[PDB]
Design an enzyme around this catalytic site. Structure first.
Site, PDB file in Angstrom:
ATOM      1  N   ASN A   1      12.900   9.877  -0.229  1.00  0.00           N
ATOM      2  CA  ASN A   1      11.891  10.928  -0.164  1.00  0.00           C
ATOM      3  C   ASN A   1      12.429  12.252   0.367  1.00  0.00           C
ATOM      4  O   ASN A   1      11.924  13.313  -0.018  1.00  0.00           O
ATOM      5  CB  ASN A   1      10.716  10.457   0.693  1.00  0.00           C
ATOM      6  CG  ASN A   1      11.145  10.033   2.086  1.00  0.00           C
ATOM      7  OD1 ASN A   1      12.305  10.188   2.467  1.00  0.00           O
ATOM      8  ND2 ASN A   1      10.207   9.487   2.852  1.00  0.00           N
TER       9      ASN A   1
ATOM     10  N   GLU B   1      -4.256  -4.996   2.700  1.00  0.00           N
ATOM     11  CA  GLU B   1      -5.291  -4.324   3.470  1.00  0.00           C
ATOM     12  C   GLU B   1      -6.331  -3.744   2.525  1.00  0.00           C
ATOM     13  O   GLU B   1      -5.968  -3.039   1.572  1.00  0.00           O
ATOM     14  CB  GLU B   1      -4.687  -3.231   4.348  1.00  0.00           C
ATOM     15  CG  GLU B   1      -3.705  -3.765   5.378  1.00  0.00           C
ATOM     16  CD  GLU B   1      -2.268  -3.726   4.900  1.00  0.00           C
ATOM     17  OE1 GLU B   1      -2.046  -3.708   3.671  1.00  0.00           O
ATOM     18  OE2 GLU B   1      -1.360  -3.730   5.757  1.00  0.00           O
TER      19      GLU B   1
ATOM     20  N   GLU C   1      19.492  -3.257 -23.567  1.00  0.00           N
ATOM     21  CA  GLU C   1      20.699  -2.453 -23.720  1.00  0.00           C
ATOM     22  C   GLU C   1      21.063  -1.776 -22.408  1.00  0.00           C
ATOM     23  O   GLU C   1      22.244  -1.676 -22.057  1.00  0.00           O
ATOM     24  CB  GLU C   1      20.513  -1.405 -24.821  1.00  0.00           C
ATOM     25  CG  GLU C   1      20.333  -1.933 -26.247  1.00  0.00           C
ATOM     26  CD  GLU C   1      19.104  -2.803 -26.428  1.00  0.00           C
ATOM     27  OE1 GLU C   1      18.215  -2.773 -25.555  1.00  0.00           O
ATOM     28  OE2 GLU C   1      19.017  -3.501 -27.459  1.00  0.00           O
TER      29      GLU C   1
ATOM     30  N   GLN D   1       0.812  -1.210   0.000  1.00  0.00           N
ATOM     31  CA  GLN D   1       0.000   0.000   0.000  1.00  0.00           C
ATOM     32  C   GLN D   1       0.847   1.262   0.000  1.00  0.00           C
ATOM     33  O   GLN D   1       0.319   2.352  -0.245  1.00  0.00           O
ATOM     34  CB  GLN D   1      -0.991  -0.023   1.172  1.00  0.00           C
ATOM     35  CG  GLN D   1      -0.427  -0.085   2.596  1.00  0.00           C
ATOM     36  CD  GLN D   1       0.373   1.132   3.023  1.00  0.00           C
ATOM     37  OE1 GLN D   1      -0.058   2.269   2.837  1.00  0.00           O
ATOM     38  NE2 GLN D   1       1.517   0.894   3.661  1.00  0.00           N
TER      39      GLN D   1
HETATM   40  N1  GTP Z   1       5.978   4.010  -1.915  1.00  0.00           N
HETATM   41  C1  GTP Z   1       5.394   4.859  -1.078  1.00  0.00           C
HETATM   42  N2  GTP Z   1       5.871   4.981   0.207  1.00  0.00           N
HETATM   43  C2  GTP Z   1       5.278   5.837   1.064  1.00  0.00           C
HETATM   44  C3  GTP Z   1       4.184   6.600   0.672  1.00  0.00           C
HETATM   45  N3  GTP Z   1       3.835   7.353   1.751  1.00  0.00           N
HETATM   46  C4  GTP Z   1       4.669   7.070   2.787  1.00  0.00           C
HETATM   47  N4  GTP Z   1       5.573   6.126   2.368  1.00  0.00           N
HETATM   48  C5  GTP Z   1       6.678   5.487   3.113  1.00  0.00           C
HETATM   49  O1  GTP Z   1       6.603   4.090   2.862  1.00  0.00           O
HETATM   50  C6  GTP Z   1       6.480   3.328   4.055  1.00  0.00           C
HETATM   51  C7  GTP Z   1       5.328   2.332   3.925  1.00  0.00           C
HETATM   52  O2  GTP Z   1       5.752   1.013   4.204  1.00  0.00           O
HETATM   53  P1  GTP Z   1       4.715  -0.069   4.803  1.00  0.00           P
HETATM   54  O3  GTP Z   1       3.973   0.553   5.960  1.00  0.00           O
HETATM   55  O4  GTP Z   1       5.453  -1.297   5.264  1.00  0.00           O
HETATM   56  O5  GTP Z   1       3.689  -0.406   3.605  1.00  0.00           O
HETATM   57  P2  GTP Z   1       3.012  -1.853   3.363  1.00  0.00           P
HETATM   58  O6  GTP Z   1       3.998  -3.000   3.369  1.00  0.00           O
HETATM   59  O7  GTP Z   1       2.252  -1.817   2.061  1.00  0.00           O
HETATM   60  O8  GTP Z   1       1.972  -2.132   4.564  1.00  0.00           O
HETATM   61  P3  GTP Z   1       1.273  -1.013   5.478  1.00  0.00           P
HETATM   62  O9  GTP Z   1       1.821  -1.125   6.890  1.00  0.00           O
HETATM   63  O10 GTP Z   1      -0.207  -1.290   5.543  1.00  0.00           O
HETATM   64  O11 GTP Z   1       1.492   0.341   4.836  1.00  0.00           O
HETATM   65  C8  GTP Z   1       6.233   4.303   5.195  1.00  0.00           C
HETATM   66  O12 GTP Z   1       7.104   4.031   6.271  1.00  0.00           O
HETATM   67  C9  GTP Z   1       6.512   5.675   4.613  1.00  0.00           C
HETATM   68  O13 GTP Z   1       7.688   6.187   5.193  1.00  0.00           O
HETATM   69  C10 GTP Z   1       3.688   6.476  -0.637  1.00  0.00           C
HETATM   70  O14 GTP Z   1       2.706   7.102  -1.060  1.00  0.00           O
HETATM   71  N5  GTP Z   1       4.307   5.596  -1.498  1.00  0.00           N
END
Ligand code: GTP
Ligand code: GTP
Ligand code: GTP
EC number: 3.6.5.-
Lengths: 438, 37, 185, 427, 100, 178, 438
Positions: free
Chosen positions: A206, A71, A254, A11
């Site tokens: 970021n 989720e 390439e 997510q």
């Molecule tokens: N790629 C991405 N990363 C984000 C975004 N917003 C915040 N983040 C960072 O990405 C991390 C999200 O990692 P996880 O929480 O493990 O995401 P997940 O494995 O899909 O599972 P969740 O806990 O439900 O989010 C956070 O710690 C943020 O620092 C976004 O829109 N895209």
């Protein structure tokens, strides 16, 4: 022909791929419904979309991507969004249980009963594709769900299809910012599993993305909408070779053959030079020379590494827009004569140029400038081992005091595999300095 | 190895159509050591 | 099977004088019994085979269905006491064209139906230690118009009291039949 | 067409049938006067199963009331629907029963059976083709047991080809009030098991607990108990009168219910029973219906089948359902307690779906079951017989009537045989 | 519609006029001509031209519903036909499309 | 070959007389009373059976029955073609040498033989047509046996049997009118 | 010419029957009144209905079927339905008494006085018919009245007319679901009586039909409105060859000859490949390839059997819609190249194709998709014997403890006829493996 499949796990990775696909519908003029005006572009599915969308005789552009999440919250809201009618319901692979940031939980507890289903997607996309050069994996190292679940599937996709390319894109963990103290755990878990299977993994951070916003874009309060917009531009630029043509056309093959010098390390850095506010673009001028300097300006990198503490091996410039070989070849010749730019003596030439005539278009409701001459700067240096060196002294502390281990050994794991990751990183870094040693 | 969907479903399902009743997709397609066992 | 043995004369495959004759008689006990009672008029051990259902419990040759029988002889005489119940049996043989076929004989049968693989026959007979006569060659030419070749397997169902099973090549008279074949009341 | 004629006997059955008939009229929407207010076309068509026609749109019930005491019949004649019952159908005697089985079985019945048979054959010729009959009475009720045992025997030879339903209530296990009541029971059940095929088993003590469980209003009336049980008997009859893909014939049902002839005693089972707040605190879903449908507390008949195991179970569903939910619910309960069924028969469930809901609620059901929990019923009566036959208590009356100990010997012997029969079939 | 033909030999007349019916499939612009079947007719009835697209000119164009008004004469592989009138939904749809 | 095991199983009562560098065979049960219909084509599968000593039985019985079973082969002819045709397909010189010697006695065995064979000409003539010249001590020359078969066959064949052979065999000459 | 008569015994077989003419009247545009609009299709009764309906000079399409039932309940309200005016009153053969699930009661007690009336119908239908290829018998093995009453009539129609085809279609008993323990009794009574007289019998099972509903149609709570539609489209597809034409036309006689290998066993299995929801087909594509996979996908079968536990003998595919031989013959060739698919070595070819250009249409108030390419897959395999294997160990338990026999012997049977079926069944299984044994 020339097509690929995008993968969006976590997510964290869901909005950005949505943003990328939102971007993709603009440059092709794709209406949110899923059809063009009375103008004739529909058929069996063979036009500029045939590499990205599947607009069959039904007339609906079907994007060639699958969004997987654990989720249901964010995946259902986008299923209630604006382009949800375009999206395939069970391509939006939903979940009902989280991994709680645990790499192994999403790798063992639940990923087993889901990988078969998502595999049913990837195989069922295989038949409609013809060339299918590779994949576009979007994930994150500190994946609450991105980290663990991707690791299992990339292992499964590696073993069944080892004859094609796999492109990995993950937000690199913030060096000094930690939204999770377990993030070093799952992150290093991802690395050692990916070193022996991943083809080309590209990272981004970021913090410096924000640092750009209030330096040249002049935005002190951007958002993901802005953040996802710029990375969506990055992948758009690299995919423009598939979309349009130019003076020369280049492909990821390439890219792979020329960028990575040796096995294991396949982790270069991207950079896009013409990132500027509209007003600064307005009463100034853009040309190859200054954007070449700007793209080579060390603070313009979104990774907290200064090249002067490392050395260059590979550098790729992908010029999208109106350019001519004359100024390009002359300007780079001056860059080779530059002394501060310290390439390794092993490579006499380390320059891969891609020319595309199509101008990079702006997005409605966007914040970018109007770019005539663009370049996405792909490069690899030895100033990168700093990030991993940051992780280990972090990691070596907690592991000795073995914090949170009761959680992982609680759901069924042991320390030997955590033990392996440390010398694997120790192996990686020593290769980095040994190749650094000329 | 495996070319396509019909074989993909058929080779690894662990689903006896005679025995399996009122099951779900996840329950229907169930592979083997391909995943872990 | 034991075709290497000589088909000349009689072929007594089952006979209750043996202590353990069940070697090649595979039994499928199902809500019945396997018992060896003595008799009154022949005052000897017999094979008590009974069950609540005929199809549930039945004795067969061979013991292993994979292997054949391999018998030339076109006649057979079975020693059986009329037990006033539902006894049936079947034989599966081979004809000239090598298409296999069964001859199912059942006591209760009200009709006689011929299926290209199985023939259903009725059995009505008297009480006591009644006897059995069948020409295998006759049924093949009469039913399918074919030529008999070989026994392949014979199955005997429940509700029966057996003393001996033996084949024959002709309609052997009682004379050459030995004393144990000259059954005495 | 196929119809049913009802028999109302015994002084409790006098209160039973009154409630049962008024429910039908209210269910079908006829006024107390008898002039039906046309509101449902389906109930208009399938009312001839029980009622015949009189002039002026008056629906004459095809039932018979029999008793001995004028006051009770006058009371029910003065009830909210006494006008819809016929003085022609009011047959009775000039004697008080003495609550004596033998008097109601040999003495007073002798001069009354002639009339009632001359009665019932009149309605029998009035109707076209009966499925059979049903009788409301009690096994411990003196006049009802005395009359019914006589009537069921005589109508056996008359029409041995019809649906011969019997409805009796088991007296209170803790107190029988009547003390010669077990004597009446064994005499009745001896012919009953000989002369019934269907028998419903109902007890008041469970009903009192059911009030303590779900009614929760402290002081019912016996009519409320009549209201509850009449709803139950109505549900099994909803199959015949109502459309929907469910097979209604009790013969369609009984053959599914009777593996062996000596299984005649059957237990009711009913669907949602609701308390004061739960009318608007209940999510009316088939799972919670089936959960409450299969509740040892929802049991009302005799006692807990928890002591024994389940022989046959049959649930009839009334309302807007589908075959799939009952299908999975059946798998759930099948998987819930598989061992608590008998290995003698698997798949012991028989389901019927009436698409026409009741008047007042949408989701509903009635359950008819057969478990191994009747052994308690006739073992609790057993020691009573032995204890009082030990010293021939209250016996000089029956000798004065003309009875002796000999009949009691096979009466208990018949009962004892049933003890092993239920015992052996399960154990 | 209707069509004519000429008797070369027989006893009775010089020419034969025959009524037909025109069917235009709106979904794919295929067409079919079905003559009504009549008894004692001395002619085989049924289907004359099966369902297909009728070639309008020699390039391979097809008779499209824009170009079909009342009283229009059209050739279908030889025989030239004449339109008489239409049925309820036809004029409604065609005037909805707009053909005067 | 089904027939080979049939008397490996053992149902045919035949013996032999004993020798060192030659051939001679004996009998147990008289053929004339045994069978000419149920045992005839089965034993002709013995001609298709070439394995010692089972081959020794083959030619002996076939010729021996001919001198002792003359006017009984008439209603059995259609069945007898099959063992012959299978032997034709066998494609081995020694086998074919055996066949023609057998067919030579077969054609001249009794009356009506070729006349009954009239429907069954085009099943034997073709493969002999193709043998015509593919190749006194032991009668070895296959080509000589071929013309010997054709000559006796045509004179005994009738009126159009000869031109039927000529139709099949384009080289073929006559032994009657040239 | 090309016509037939359909038969419907049991109130189970009548509401399902009602659906198909509710279906059949649509594709011909038949109004509920009984007549066309002002458009001309009436005459002596010779048009697309002539094979199905009898629309004489009176102008009323008279369907060529007879509805027989033993209970006036289900026949009366349908006599008050919507198309009842189309229905001939006394071909809605009503009854006053039921069989109480008893095979013999509907076979002896009441069937005697009713079939003669039914015989009057069929002969008075026989005289008007011209070619009358055969009959369409709709029934149920677990028939409370379908089982017994059909058995006597199918005997009587066999003896008088043994020269034409008889097509049998019944709901197979649910293997693990039993709404009646009397069902194994009457069902095996049908099978042993029907095996030597039925020409081609076909079985379906509702559980997987329901399982399909929430698998791909995604309906957790359907009704027979859906179910009768699904079986109705199956019989519509097989009858499209009679209605319309295509590349080639195929007929029941060829079906019988090419499907049944040997006598007795004449019990193939059907399957409809394009079973999907409306919105799925909306943004997805249908082609011969995937639907061939779906039709040969083992869980798409409505009969509970694992084909890998058996072996294929015959497979008949009837493609209704717009297709081409090129992909089809290529697609089926790839199927022949498949290794898991284990046909018996006896048959080199086992494919029976019927091509019809007409697209399958939707139904008003329906749930189906918009099909352009459809196929009805008729196959037979040896994986079916387990069903009778299920029934015998089911049946043998009851028979030893002879449950409910007092009901049967109460109204006039004995033990022998029940004995017959078990070795008749035991013959069936023992024939099944020997043909399976190559
Ligand atoms: N790629 C991405 N990363 C984000 C975004 N917003 C915040 N983040 C960072 O990405 C991390 C999200 O990692 P996880 O929480 O493990 O995401 P997940 O494995 O899909 O599972 P969740 O806990 O439900 O989010 C956070 O710690 C943020 O620092 C976004 O829109 N895209
Ligand atoms: N009407 C009525 N009967 C009840 C009630 N409670 C228990 N009963 C019993 O129901 C039984 C059946 O009534 P009947 O069969 O008419 O009784 P009977 O034949 O007149 O003889 P008795 O049992 O002495 O009354 C009676 O014996 C009562 O004891 C009640 O509240 N109302
Ligand atoms: N064909 C069909 N079967 C149904 C339908 N609904 C339920 N069923 C099943 O079909 C079976 C009906 O068979 P039977 O009860 O023997 O029908 P019958 O022989 O006409 O006699 P009845 O007992 O009166 O219904 C039931 O057991 C149900 O499981 C339906 O709409 N159509």
């Amino acid at each position: 022909m020339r097509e690929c499949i995008s993968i969006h796990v976590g997510q964290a990775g869901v909005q950005i791929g949505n943003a990328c696909w939102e971007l993709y519908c603009l440059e092709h003029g794709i209406q949110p419904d899923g059809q063009m005006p009375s103008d004739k572009t529909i058929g069996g599915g063979d036009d500029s979309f045939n590499t990205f969308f599947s607009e069959t005789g039904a007339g609906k552009h079907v994007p060639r991507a699958v969004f997987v999440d654990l989720e249901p919250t964010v995946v259902d809201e986008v299923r209630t969004g604006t382009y949800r009618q375009l999206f395939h319901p069970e391509q939006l692979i939903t979940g009902k249980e989280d991994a709680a940031n645990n790499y192994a939980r999403g790798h063992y507890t639940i990923g087993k009963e889901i990988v078969d289903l998502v595999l049913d997607r990837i195989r069922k996309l295989a038949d409609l594709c013809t060339g299918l050069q590779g994949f576009l994996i979007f994930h994150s190292f500190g994946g609450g769900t991105g980290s663990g679940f991707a690791s299992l599937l990339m292992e499964r996709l590696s073993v069944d299809y080892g004859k094609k390319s796999k492109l990995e894109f993950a937000i690199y963990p913030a060096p000094q910012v930690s939204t999770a103290v377990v993030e070093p755990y799952n992150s290093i878990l991802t690395t050692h599993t990916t070193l022996e299977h991943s083809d080309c993994a590209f990272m981004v951070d970021n913090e410096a993305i924000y640092d750009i916003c209030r330096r040249n874009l002049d935005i002190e309060r951007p958002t993901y909408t802005n953040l996802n917009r710029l990375i969506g531009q990055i992948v758009s630029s690299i995919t423009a070779s598939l979309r349009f043509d130019g003076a020369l056309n280049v492909d990821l093959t390439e890219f792979q053959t020329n960028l990575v010098p040796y096995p294991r390390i396949h982790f270069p850095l991207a950079t896009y030079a013409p990132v500027i506010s509209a007003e600064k673009a307005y009463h100034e001028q853009l040309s190859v020379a200054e954007i070449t300097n700007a793209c080579f300006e060390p603070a313009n990198q979104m990774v907290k590494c200064d090249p002067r503490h490392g050395k260059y091996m590979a550098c790729c410039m992908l010029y999208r827009g109106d350019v001519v070989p004359k100024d390009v070849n002359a300007a780079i010749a001056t860059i080779k004569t530059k002394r501060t730019i310290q390439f390794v003596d092993w490579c006499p030439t380390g320059f891969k140029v891609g020319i595309n005539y199509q101008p990079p278009t702006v997005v409605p409701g966007g914040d970018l400038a109007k770019v005539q001459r663009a370049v996405c700067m792909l490069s690899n240096t030895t100033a990168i081992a700093e990030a991993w060196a940051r992780l280990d002294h972090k990691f070596d502390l907690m592991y000795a005091k073995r914090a949170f281990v009761h959680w992982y050994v609680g759901e069924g794991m042991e320390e030997g595999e955590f033990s392996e990751a440390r010398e694997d990183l120790a192996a990686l870094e020593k290769d980095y300095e040994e190749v650094g040693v000329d | 190895k495996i070319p396509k969907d019909d074989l993909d479903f058929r080779l690894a399902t662990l689903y006896n159509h005679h025995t399996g009743a009122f099951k779900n997709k996840t329950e229907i397609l169930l592979h083997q050591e391909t995943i872990e066992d | 099977m034991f075709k290497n043995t000589f088909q000349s004369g009689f072929l007594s495959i089952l006979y209750s004088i043996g202590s353990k004759p069940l070697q090649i008689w595979d039994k499928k006990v199902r809500n019945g019994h396997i018992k060896r009672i003595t008799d009154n008029d022949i005052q000897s051990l017999v094979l008590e085979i009974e069950g609540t259902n005929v199809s549930t419990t039945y004795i067969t040759c061979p013991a292993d269905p994979k292997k054949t029988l391999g018998i030339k002889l076109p006649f057979l005489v079975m020693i059986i006491k009329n037990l006033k119940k539902y006894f049936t049996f079947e034989v599966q043989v081979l004809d000239d064209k090598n298409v296999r076929r069964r001859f199912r004989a059942s006591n209760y049968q009200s009709t006689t139906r011929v299926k290209p693989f199985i023939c259903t026959m009725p059995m009505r007979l008297d009480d006591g230690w009644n006897q059995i006569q069948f020409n295998l060659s006759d049924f093949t030419r009469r039913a399918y118009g074919t030529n008999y070749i070989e026994t392949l397997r014979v199955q005997i169902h429940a509700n029966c009291r057996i003393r001996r099973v033996y084949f024959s090549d002709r309609l052997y008279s009682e004379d050459e039949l030995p004393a144990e074949f000259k059954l005495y009341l | 067409m196929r119809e049913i004629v009802h028999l109302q006997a015994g002084q409790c059955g006098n209160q039973i049938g009154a409630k049962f008939w008024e429910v039908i009229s209210d269910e079908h929407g006829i006024d107390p006067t008898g002039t039906y207010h046309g509101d449902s076309d389906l109930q208009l068509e399938r009312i001839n199963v029980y009622y015949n026609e009189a002039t002026g749109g008056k629906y004459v019930p095809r039932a018979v009331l029999v008793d001995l005491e004028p006051g009770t019949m006058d009371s029910v004649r003065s009830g909210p629907f006494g006008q819809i019952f016929r003085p022609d159908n009011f047959v009775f005697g000039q004697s008080g029963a003495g609550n004596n089985w033998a008097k109601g079985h040999y003495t007073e019945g002798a001069e009354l059976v002639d009339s009632v048979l001359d009665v019932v054959r009149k309605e029998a010729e009035s109707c076209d083709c009966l499925q059979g009959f049903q009788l409301t009475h009690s096994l411990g009720g003196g006049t009802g047991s005395g009359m019914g045992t006589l009537l069921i025997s005589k109508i056996r030879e008359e029409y041995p080809d019809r649906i011969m339903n019997t409805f009796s209530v088991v007296p209170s296990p803790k107190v029988s009030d009547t003390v010669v009541e077990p004597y009446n029971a064994t005499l009745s059940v001896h012919q009953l098991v000989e002369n019934t095929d269907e028998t419903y088993c109902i007890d008041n003590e469970a009903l009192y607990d059911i009030c303590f469980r779900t009614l929760k209003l402290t002081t019912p009336t016996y009519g409320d108990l009549n209201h509850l049980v009449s709803a139950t008997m109505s549900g099994v009859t909803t199959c015949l009168r109502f459309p929907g893909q469910l097979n209604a014939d009790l013969r369609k049902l009984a053959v599914n219910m009777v593996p062996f002839p000596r299984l005649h005693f059957f237990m009711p089972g009913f669907a949602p029973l609701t308390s004061r707040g739960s009318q608007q605190y209940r999510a009316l879903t088939v799972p919670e219906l089936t959960q409450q449908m299969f509740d040892a507390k929802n049991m009302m008949a005799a006692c807990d089948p928890r002591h024994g195991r389940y022989l046959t179970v049959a649930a009839v569903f009334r309302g807007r359902m589908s075959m799939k939910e009952v299908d999975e619910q059946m798998l759930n309960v099948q998987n819930k307690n598989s061992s608590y069924f008998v290995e003698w028969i698997p798949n012991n469930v028989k389901t019927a779906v009436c698409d026409i809901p009741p008047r007042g609620l949408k989701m509903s059901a009635t359950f008819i079951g057969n478990s191994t929990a009747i052994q308690e019923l006739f073992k609790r009566i057993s020691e009573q017989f032995t204890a009082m036959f030990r010293r021939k208590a209250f016996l000089h009356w029956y000798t004065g009537e003309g009875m002796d100990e000999m009949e009691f010997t096979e009466a208990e012997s018949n009962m004892n045989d049933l003890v092993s029969e239920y015992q052996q079939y399960q154990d | 519609a209707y069509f004519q033909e000429d008797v070369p030999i027989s006893m009775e007349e010089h020419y034969r006029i025959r009524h037909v019916n025109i069917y235009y499939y709106l979904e794919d612009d295929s067409m079919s001509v079905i003559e009504p079947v009549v008894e004692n007719s001395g002619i085989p009835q049924g289907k004359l031209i099966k369902r297909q697209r009728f070639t309008k000119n020699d390039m391979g164009d097809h008779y499209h519903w824009k170009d079909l008004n009342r009283g229009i004469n059209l050739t279908v592989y030889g025989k030239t036909f004449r339109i008489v009138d239409c049925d309820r939904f036809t004029q409604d749809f065609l005037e909805s499309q707009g053909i005067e | 070959t089904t027939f080979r095991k049939c008397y490996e199983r053992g149902d045919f009562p035949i013996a032999l007389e004993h020798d060192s560098k030659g051939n001679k065979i004996a009998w147990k049960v008289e053929i004339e009373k045994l069978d000419y219909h149920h045992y005839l084509p089965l034993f002709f599968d013995g001609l298709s059976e070439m394995t010692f000593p089972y081959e020794f039985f083959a030619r002996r019985g076939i010729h021996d029955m001919l001198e002792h079973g003359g006017n009984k082969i008439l209603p059995v002819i259609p069945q007898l073609i099959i063992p012959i045709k299978n032997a034709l397909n066998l494609r081995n010189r020694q086998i074919i040498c055996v066949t023609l010697k057998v067919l030579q006695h077969l054609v001249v065995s009794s009356e009506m033989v070729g006349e009954a064979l009239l429907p069954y000409y085009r099943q034997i003539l073709p493969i002999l047509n193709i043998f015509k010249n593919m190749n006194q001590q032991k009668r070895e020359n296959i080509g000589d046996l071929i013309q010997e078969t054709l000559e006796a066959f045509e004179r005994y064949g009738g009126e159009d049997a000869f031109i039927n052979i000529k139709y099949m065999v384009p080289t073929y000459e006559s032994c009657l009118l040239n």
